[PDB]
């Protein structure tokens, strides 16, 4: 996250931190995600497409720090890893960049709400807030585009939803932003998602409720004028989501 502020898991208790175990026994951070029900975390397909094997991944909830333990955290295995079958990666952008992880503890339990863990509501199908609405993004992504290390403490910031009208302008992203995506940025362009934030939530208030409206996908640079963050438009994937989740 560029700009914004350090925060703790209690302010973003749906945030899921996803790691991959290495054949060495090294474990490194992969991506963010969001807890949409006790057994289900949603993220981006591109985080896993390269290594698509559920066994290699661990999911933490209740975790405020990247490489050290938070009290109240809970560790989970991936029971199944559901990528999107129409996922595609272009020269610039990702398409249908959405994924599901079913989580279970070694004990066999799903997530349990807590000071530090809570589910986040899905929006109603095709129901998204209006452009200019302020939303929150969270993650362990780079604090600057040029950095080589990731921050150890979770961060969040506030961005504003952009119209497709405006996001399609050629000096923005042109034809490369489709209606299954959502743009969001700071009007002054000083805060943004960045590398390492992918899979994480864009959260807005939609008719009273804190709702999962986007999933961090791609953007050009970070906090670069005229180049906003692009997110998977979650309202457009409920059928996909319910098919795989109602099980």
């Amino acid at each position: 996250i560029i700009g914004g502020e350090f925060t703790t898991i209690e302010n973003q208790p749906w945030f899921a931190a996803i790691y991959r175990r290495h054949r060495g026994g090294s474990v490194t951070y992969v991506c963010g995600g969001s807890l949409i029900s006790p057994c289900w975390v949603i993220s981006a397909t591109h985080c896993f497409i390269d290594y698509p094997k559920k066994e290699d991944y661990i999911v933490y909830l209740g975790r405020s720090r990247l490489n050290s333990n938070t009290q109240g955290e809970m560790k989970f295995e991936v029971e199944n890893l559901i990528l999107h079958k129409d996922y595609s990666a272009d020269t610039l952008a990702y398409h249908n960049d959405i994924a599901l992880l079913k989580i279970r503890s070694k004990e066999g339990r799903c997530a349990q709400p807590s000071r530090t863990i809570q589910t986040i509501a899905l929006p109603s199908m095709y129901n998204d807030p209006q452009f200019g609405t302020s939303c929150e993004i969270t993650g362990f992504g780079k604090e600057q585009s040029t950095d080589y290390l990731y921050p150890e403490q979770l961060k969040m910031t506030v961005v504003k939803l952009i119209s497709h009208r405006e996001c399609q302008q050629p000096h923005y992203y042109g034809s490369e932003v489709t209606t299954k995506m959502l743009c969001a940025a700071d009007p002054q362009w000083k805060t943004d998602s960045c590398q390492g934030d992918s899979g994480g939530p864009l959260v807005c208030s939609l008719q009273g409720r804190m709702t999962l409206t986007g999933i961090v996908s791609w953007g050009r640079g970070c906090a670069l004028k005229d180049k906003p963050g692009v997110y998977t438009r979650v309202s457009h994937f409920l059928p996909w989501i319910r098919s795989h989740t109602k099980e």
């Binding site: 951070y29 992969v30 991506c31 981006a44 591109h46 985080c47 390269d50 990666a89 272009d90 020269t91 610039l92 952008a93 990702y94 992504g141 990731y150 998602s193 960045c194 590398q195 390492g196 934030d197 992918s198 961090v216 996908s217 791609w218 953007g219 050009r220 692009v230």
Partner: peptide, 10 residues
Amino acid sequence: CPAYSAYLDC
């Protein structure tokens, strides 16, 4: 990797 990916491994 897409040129605009935010994925840490790219």
